[PDB]
Amino acid sequence: EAPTIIDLTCTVATCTHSSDFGGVLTLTYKTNKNGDCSVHSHSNVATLQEATAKVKTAGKVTLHFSTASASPSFVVSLCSARATCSASCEP
Structure with missing residues (x-):
């Protein structure tokens, strides 16, 4: 069974609006165990x-x-x- 994810919150650390992956985000949460999650x-x-x-x-x-x-x-x-x-991103 999948990990149970609690208190999920997101923070975008850096954002540039572009054609590449110019965004980096961190998800913070509590969980019961290590495991795979789909995103x-x-x-x-x-x-x-x-x-x-x-x-x-x-x-x-x-x-x-x-x-x-x-x-x-x-x-x-x-x-x-x-x-x-x-x-809020940047060019």
Whole structure:
């Protein structure tokens, strides 16, 4: 069974709105165990690089994304948990 993800929160560390993955985000959470989680975002505004993350009990996952918006906000799932990622980017 998948890790149970609690207190999922997102922080966008750096954001450049470009054609490459100019975005880096950190998901913080609590979990019961190490395991694999799918990560998803269904957004007209950002695209995740990753499909899956190796969740650890240390409680942080780093993901990358691309956006054509200077003000992206997008919901990311980690296993069953969902959190909003939001940022003001730069060109």
